[PDB]
C-alpha cells in the first residue's frame, strides 16, 4: 500500500496472509469467505514468466493478523491448504484475465474478534455499488513505494474509475472481468496497491444492510501510485458462478 495508513485492530477480520514456508516470507494477500475457503489472485500461485508455480504444501495461510512480521501468539491462526483451484481460463500469457483462485483449508477456522468472513456480492449488490466515483478499501502488507515495507497492515480508500479512463491509461488489453481504481492526476489525493498486496481484497460497505462485500482482488498495475496510471482488480462478481461451482462441488 502506497500513501495509506495503519489499519486499526479488527478493521479487516477477513484479511489473510499467504505465507511461504521456505524461505519464510510474505507471498500475497488473500481473504476469508467462509470457515473453509480463502480467495486470492491466481498469479500468486501460477505465473511462468517469473517461474512461479506453488502447490498446496509450499505454503501456509495466516488469519487474524495485524503486524507484518511478528508471530501474533493467541491472536493469529495458521492454517494449511488441502486443495488449490485456479480458474481454468486464467490468461497469464496475455493480460492476466481471470486472475482468481480458491484455496480449501485443511480444517475449518474458528471465528473471533479478529477473524471473520467477508461477504461475496450478489447481482443486486454489485450493481448498486460498483459505480465510478464510489470508493472502496484495499488492505495489504506490501511495499510502501514503487522503488521499505510496513510494520503494520496498511489501508487505503480508493475511488472506482470509469472503464474508458482505465482503457486509455495502458497498452494492456482490458477485459470485462477487470476494473480499475485510483485517484486521477488532478484530484490532489493519491494512493495505490503495490507489490506484496497481490491477492488482497478490495471491499465496499453496503449502505443498505451495513455489511462488507469483496468486489475485487488486487491483480496488476504498472508501477505503484504513478500519476496517470491505475490499479486493476479482478471483478469478483463476474466470476461468482465459477466460485459457487467449485465450492458446492468440492
Amino acid at each position: 500500500i502506497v500513501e495509506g495508513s495503519d489499519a486499526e485492530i479488527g478493521m479487516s477480520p477477513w484479511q489473510v496472509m499467504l505465507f511461504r514456508k521456505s524461505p519464510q516470507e510474505l507471498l500475497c494477500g488473500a481473504s476469508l469467505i467462509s470457515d473453509r475457503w480463502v480467495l486470492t489472485a491466481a498469479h500468486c500461485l501460477l505465473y511462468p514468466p517469473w517461474d512461479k508455480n506453488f502447490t498446496e504444501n509450499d505454503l501456509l495461510v495466516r488469519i487474524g493478523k495485524h503486524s507484518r512480521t511478528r508471530y501474533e501468539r493467541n491472536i493469529e491462526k495458521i492454517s494449511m491448504l488441502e486443495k488449490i483451484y485456479i480458474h481454468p481460463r486464467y490468461n497469464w500469457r496475455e493480460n492476466l484475465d481471470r486472475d482468481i483462485a480458491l484455496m480449501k483449508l485443511k480444517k475449518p477456522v474458528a471465528f473471533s474478534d479478529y477473524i471473520h468472513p467477508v461477504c461475496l456480492p450478489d447481482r443486486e449488490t454489485a450493481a448498486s455499488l460498483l459505480q465510478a466515483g464510489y470508493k472502496g478499501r484495499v488492505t495489504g502488507w506490501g511495499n510502501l513505494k514503487e522503488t521499505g515495507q510496513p510494520s503494520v497492515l496498511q489501508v487505503v480508500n480508493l475511488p472506482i474509475v470509469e472503464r474508458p479512463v482505465c482503457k486509455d491509461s495502458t497498452r494492456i488489453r482490458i477485459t470485462d472481468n477487470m476494473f480499475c481504481a485510483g485517484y486521477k492526476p488532478d484530484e490532489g489525493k493519491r494512493g495505490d496497491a503495490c507489490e506484496g498486496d497481490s491477492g488482497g481484497p478490495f471491499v465496499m460497505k453496503s449502505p443498505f444492510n451495513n455489511r462488507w462485500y469483496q468486489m475485487g482482488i488486487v491483480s496488476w498495475g504498472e508501477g505503484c501510485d504513478r500519476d496517470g496510471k491505475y490499479g486493476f482488480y479482478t471483478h469478483v462478481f463476474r466470476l461468482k458462478k465459477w466460485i459457487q461451482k467449485v465450492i458446492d462441488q468440492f
Binding site: 479488527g10 474478534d113 467477508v118 461477504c119 456480492p121
Partner: protein
Amino acid sequence: GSGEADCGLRPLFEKKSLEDKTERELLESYIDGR
C-alpha cells in the same frame, strides 16, 4: 444469503455500533460525495 448469514459484520465494529476512523469516507461517496 449469497454469503453465510453473519458475513460482513465485524466483531469489533458493526456488532457494537462502533465505526472505524475512515468508513464514512466510503459511505459519503455512495451518492455524490468526493
